[PDB]
Amino acid sequence: MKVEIDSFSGAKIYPGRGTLFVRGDSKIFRFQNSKSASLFKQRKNPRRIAWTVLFRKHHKKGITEEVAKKRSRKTVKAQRPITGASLDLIKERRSLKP
Amino acid sequence: AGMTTIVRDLDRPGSKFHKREVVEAVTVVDTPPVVVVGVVGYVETPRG
Amino acid sequence: MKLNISYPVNGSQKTFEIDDEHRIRVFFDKRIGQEVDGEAVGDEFKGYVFKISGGNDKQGFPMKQGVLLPTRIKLLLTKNVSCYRPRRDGERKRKSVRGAIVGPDLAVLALVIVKKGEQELEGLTDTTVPKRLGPKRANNIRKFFGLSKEDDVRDFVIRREVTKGEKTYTKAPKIQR
Amino acid sequence: SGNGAQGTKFRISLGLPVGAIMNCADNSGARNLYIIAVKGSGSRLNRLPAASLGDMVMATVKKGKPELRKKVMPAIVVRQAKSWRRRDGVFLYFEDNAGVIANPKGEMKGSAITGPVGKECADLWPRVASNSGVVV
Amino acid sequence: KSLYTNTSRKALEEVSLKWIDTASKFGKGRFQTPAEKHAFMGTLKKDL
RNA sequence: GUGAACAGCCUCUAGUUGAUAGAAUAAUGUAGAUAAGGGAAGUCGGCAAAAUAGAUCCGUAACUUCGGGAUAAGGAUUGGC
RNA sequence: GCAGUCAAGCGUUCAUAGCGACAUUGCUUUUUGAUUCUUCGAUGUCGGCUCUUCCUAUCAUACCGAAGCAGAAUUCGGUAA
RNA sequence: GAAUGUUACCGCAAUAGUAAUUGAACUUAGUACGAGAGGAACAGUUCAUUCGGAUAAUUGGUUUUUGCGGCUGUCUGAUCAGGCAUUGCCGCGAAGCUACCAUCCGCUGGAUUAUGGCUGAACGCCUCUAAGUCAGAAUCCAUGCUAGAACGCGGUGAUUUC
RNA sequence: UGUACAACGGGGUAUUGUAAGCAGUAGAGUAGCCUUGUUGUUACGAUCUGCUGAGAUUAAGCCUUUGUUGUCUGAUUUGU
Numbered sequence: 015m016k017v018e019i020d021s022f023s024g025a026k027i028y029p030g031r032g033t034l035f036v037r038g039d040s041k042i043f044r045f046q047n048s049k050s051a052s053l054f055k056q057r058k059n060p061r062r063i064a065w066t067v068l069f070r071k072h073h074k075k076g077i078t079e080e081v082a083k084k085r086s087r088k089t090v091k092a093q094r095p096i097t098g099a100s101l102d103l104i105k106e107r108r109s110l111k112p
Numbered sequence: 113a114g115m116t117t118i119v120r121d122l123d124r125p126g127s128k129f130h131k132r133e134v135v136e137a138v139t140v141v142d143t144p145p146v147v148v149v150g151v152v153g154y155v156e157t158p159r160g
Numbered sequence: 161m162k163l164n165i166s167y168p169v170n171g172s173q174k175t176f177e178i179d180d181e182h183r184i185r186v187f188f189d190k191r192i193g194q195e196v197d198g199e200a201v202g203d204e205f206k207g208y209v210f211k212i213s214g215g216n217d218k219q220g221f222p223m224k225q226g227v228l229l230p231t232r233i234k235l236l237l238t239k240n241v242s243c244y245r246p247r248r249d250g251e252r253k254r255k256s257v258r259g260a261i262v263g264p265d266l267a268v269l270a271l272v273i274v275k276k277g278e279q280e281l282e283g284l285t286d287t288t289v290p291k292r293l294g295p296k297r298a299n300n301i302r303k304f305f306g307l308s309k310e311d312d313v314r315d316f317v318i319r320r321e322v323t324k325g326e327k328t329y330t331k332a333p334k335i336q337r
Numbered sequence: 338s339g340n341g342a343q344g345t346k347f348r349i350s351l352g353l354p355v356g357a358i359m360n361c362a363d364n365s366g367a368r369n370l371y372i373i374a375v376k377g378s379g380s381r382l383n384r385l386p387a388a389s390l391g392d393m394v395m396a397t398v399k400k401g402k403p404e405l406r407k408k409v410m411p412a413i414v415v416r417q418a419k420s421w422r423r424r425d426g427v428f429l430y431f432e433d434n435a436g437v438i439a440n441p442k443g444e445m446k447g448s449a450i451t452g453p454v455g456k457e458c459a460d461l462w463p464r465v466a467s468n469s470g471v472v473v
Numbered sequence: 474k475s476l477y478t479n480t481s482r483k484a485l486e487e488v489s490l491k492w493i494d495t496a497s498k499f500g501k502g503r504f505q506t507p508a509e510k511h512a513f514m515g516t517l518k519k520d521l
Numbered sequence: 522g523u524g525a526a527c528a529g530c531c532u533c534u535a536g537u538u539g540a541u542a543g544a545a546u547a548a549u550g551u552a553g554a555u556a557a558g559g560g561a562a563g564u565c566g567g568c569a570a571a572a573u574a575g576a577u578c579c580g581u582a583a584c585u586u587c588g589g590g591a592u593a594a595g596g597a598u599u600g601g602c
Numbered sequence: 603g604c605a606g607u608c609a610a611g612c613g614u615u616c617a618u619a620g621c622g623a624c625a626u627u628g629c630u631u632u633u634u635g636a637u638u639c640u641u642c643g644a645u646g647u648c649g650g651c652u653c654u655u656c657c658u659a660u661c662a663u664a665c666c667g668a669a670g671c672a673g674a675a676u677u678c679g680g681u682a683a
Numbered sequence: 684g685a686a687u688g689u690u691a692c693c694g695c696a697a698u699a700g701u702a703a704u705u706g707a708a709c710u711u712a713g714u715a716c717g718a719g720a721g722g723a724a725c726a727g728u729u730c731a732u733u734c735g736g737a738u739a740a741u742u743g744g745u746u747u748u749u750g751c752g753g754c755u756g757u758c759u760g761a762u763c764a765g766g767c768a769u770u771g772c773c774g775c776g777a778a779g780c781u782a783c784c785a786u787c788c789g790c791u792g793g794a795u796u797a798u799g800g801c802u803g804a805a806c807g808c809c810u811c812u813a814a815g816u817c818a819g820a821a822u823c824c825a826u827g828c829u830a831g832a833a834c835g836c837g838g839u840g841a842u843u844u845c
Numbered sequence: 846u847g848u849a850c851a852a853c854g855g856g857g858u859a860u861u862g863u864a865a866g867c868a869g870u871a872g873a874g875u876a877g878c879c880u881u882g883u884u885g886u887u888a889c890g891a892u893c894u895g896c897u898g899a900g901a902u903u904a905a906g907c908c909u910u911u912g913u914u915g916u917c918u919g920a921u922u923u924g925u
């Protein structure tokens with residue numbers, strides 16, 4: 015079971031729900047309701063219809079703490095040396111000086 | 113009560129939809145326990 | 161689906177299989193780069209954090225960082241981009257590409273252990289494989305030993321042994337710059 | 338359906354009653370197909386027989402090569418438009434009605450099929466599958 | 474209870490649901506739960 | 522006022538607000554509308570209905586009594602500021 | 603219009619698998635005639651549309667018997683509306 | 684719907700009605716049969732046609748939800764907000780209604796017809812028939828399904844004091 | 846006289862598509878006064894943006910409710 019999403023509005027389309035349009039050039043559109051589906055046929059542009067995901071994305075509506083930072087990074091520092099040279103005499107010659 | 117939709121795999125060897133999901137309508141009837149308050153006993157007669 | 165897991169600290173890798181829709185499910189709708197805790201996927205991995213780095217679906221088509229989408233699309237690729245090696249200067253090809261968002265269609269998820277769980281994963285944390293090559297350019301030899309331009313590299317250059325039946329040869333790089 | 342169709346077809350909404358004209362989808366020379374009958378269809382006083390996706394009709398060519406005109410021949414519906422509903426739950430419709438001219442066996446007169454093809458037809462008619470680009 | 478012991482295959486199949494729809498029947502339901510609806514929509518001028 | 526306009530539609534002056542009434546909204550009607558896909562297969566017959574339409578620009582066949590046919594056909598455009 | 607009886611013939615052979623001349627016995631009342639009994643102080647024509655029901659001399663569908671039924675196809679017949 | 688003491692609840696079942704239809708594909712099987720060309724069927728499986736009874740989760744249609752928005756013309760000094768244009772017009776539109784345009788459901792026993800048989804005399808033989816009997820059809824009777832006799836009926840509750 | 850009932854109100858569920866108000870270095874631009882501009886200043890401008898997936902409507906045969914206010918003996922008739 016896959017939840018699809020609305021080509022025009024970007025709403026979740028739970029199973030058997032709204033309608034599916036296969037356009038002239040084998041591009042497949044999915045509407046969750048005759049609303050999105052009329053607006054689509056009307057040649058309306060999703061990015062100008064305010065309630066659409068697409069519109070809100072474009073107009074940066076209510077995203078807030080997705081621009082908030084995080085705490086994601088590693089902590090490594092481990093030697094393996096060089097394959098073929100005996101990784102024994104690679105730490106006792108690894109004593110630096112400054 | 114009402115109706116809703118179901119999604120389930122189908123077990124039907126031979127069918128084009130064997131082992132595939134189908135969506136199906138269903139009804140739901142509210143069914144609290146029934147309470148037993150009487151017994152009634154019938155006898156057979158040549159009149160029913 | 162296969163998980164292809166790397167422990168870049170050790171240089172190790174081993175694959176793991178999973179036949180559990182619910183365990184598998186955890187990776188769904190996540191993207192490349194997003195981190196994933198362990199206990200869900202398996203009790204082996206309790207603790208372990210995985211960074212999702214890519215992977216293939218059936219039909220074998222690779223994922224591609226950046227696309228978003230949980231489907232497959234055909235893109236026009238160039239030089240210096242993943243999933244395409246140009247045959248000819250100025251060549252660009254149109255090519256199918258799998259999206260970056262994980263879904264049940266993937267044959268293999270490519271994970272990369274970012275930090276270690278409460279327990280060891282056999283062929284991974286318990287085995288370690290050394291870098292093939294050593295520093296070749298003069299100052300890289302300096303920094304890989306912290307040396308200051310005084311110590312003279314010539315003897316700090318790494319040396320790899322090799323036997324000729326009853327002769328053992330020793331060959332170093334060739335410093336440069 | 339029928340002769341030359343290996344497999345069955347789960348019922349799909351009829352969209353093309355007799356008199357429907359559908360786009361001809363192959364490269365046989367024919368530009369359109371006028372439906373005069375539907376195969377294996379039954380009978381009720383006053384009902385038009387009607388085709389659905391993957392049905393074999395009997396048609397004539399209203400527009401196209403003169404060698405293709407003025408005769409009845411078999412053809413197969415490959416795109417519908419009237420929305421119909423698969424067992425997986427979806428109501429889906431194409432953007433045009435269209436079929437490809439064929440022989441009783443179900444073999445295609447032409448060799449390519451322009452545009453998409455519905456699966457339920459693909460599944461039903463091997464040589465229609467062959468000459469398909471995008472199915473569904 | 475049925476009056477006969479059907480064998481039908483259709484009868485006998487042992488179904489096992491995968492998903493029960495639970496969005497609003499009072500219109501074009503877009504959401505199973507108020508939780509899901511919160512997820513998708515974000516904070517509203519009411520809310521916290 | 523709009524508009525080509527003594528058109529339609531709204532308005533001032535003047536004049537009416539008269540036409541049994543109340544409560545419901547079954548069937549069948551009369552009068553007014555709409556319908557997915559197909560598109561005259563309906564019918565004696567496209568009956569009924571639908572479609573078209575203003576203005577500016579472009580473009581306009583047969584044939585002809587040379588006056589026409591002609592808004593032939595076919596197209597684009599049209600608000601606000 | 604439909605169905606019989608006799609059986610000379612047809613059917614390579616073979617009357618009657620399937621048919622069937624000359625004759626001849628019938629049934630039917632959606633043919634057409636023949637009649638003129640009812641209605642001329644009126645019982646609204648032809649066809650179509652719609653809708654019910656009925657008959658069987660059965661086209662299909664169920665189960666059968668026969669064949670000049672190898673099979674497949676078909677033909678003849680029965681119980682059947 | 685009067686009257687059969689009243690009123691209420693639960694039931695019986697006389698009689699009447701009654702319903703399911705047809706096809707294909709797979710498999711059997713390139714099998715049986717056949718020199719060959721060709722070429723079946725029963726059991727099993729998946730679908731379909733015609734019909735019927737419902738239903739409205741989904742999709743579609745309907746729109747006076749005159750619910751939200753848009754538009755023209757005018758009128759209320761402007762604004763806000765509105766009135767009028769026999770529902771002014773347009774896009775969307777819940778709810779209800781609704782469509783093989785949508786979904787779901789349509790039972791299994793007996794007795795028989797034709798016909799093929801058993802045993803078996805008439806007629807020492809022979810015969811499915813005379814006695815007796817087996818098997819048997821989209822038929823028939825029931826099962827099931829709809830009414831429920833307003834002059835068919837049962838079980839049960841409570842039955843008025845100014 | 847109570848898990849009562851209703852009318853409101855609240856919350857949910859829906860529908861539409863971002864209200865009025867205010868503000869703005871957004872705006873083809875335009876006026877007016879000078880102290881004639883080293884954003885000169887004061888206001889006007891279809892539309893745009895922000896507060897604002899807002900505002901409106903939402904049982905009339907949607908769901909729910911610890912809130913508010915209210916209501917809770919009129920009439921007729923029946924017996925073996």
Ligand SMILES: [Mg+2]
Binds near residue numbers: 048
């Ligand atoms: Mg619609």
Ligand SMILES: [Mg+2]
Binds near residue numbers: 048
């Ligand atoms: Mg709708």
Ligand SMILES: [Mg+2]
Binds near residue numbers: 336337
């Ligand atoms: Mg060098």
Ligand SMILES: [Mg+2]
Binds near residue numbers: 361362363451
């Ligand atoms: Mg073409």
Ligand SMILES: [Mg+2]
Binds near residue numbers: 382383
């Ligand atoms: Mg007719």
Ligand SMILES: [Mg+2]
């Ligand atoms: Mg022509």
Ligand SMILES: [Mg+2]
Binds near residue numbers: 448467468
């Ligand atoms: Mg080919």
Ligand SMILES: [Mg+2]
Binds near residue numbers: 497498499500
């Ligand atoms: Mg609803």
Ligand SMILES: [Mg+2]
């Ligand atoms: Mg007067």
Ligand SMILES: [Mg+2]
Binds near residue numbers: 540
């Ligand atoms: Mg009058």
Ligand SMILES: [Mg+2]
């Ligand atoms: Mg009245």
Ligand SMILES: [Mg+2]
Binds near residue numbers: 556
């Ligand atoms: Mg229509």
Ligand SMILES: [Mg+2]
Binds near residue numbers: 560
């Ligand atoms: Mg047309």
Ligand SMILES: [Mg+2]
């Ligand atoms: Mg005609």
Ligand SMILES: [Mg+2]
């Ligand atoms: Mg025509």
Ligand SMILES: [Mg+2]
């Ligand atoms: Mg006709």
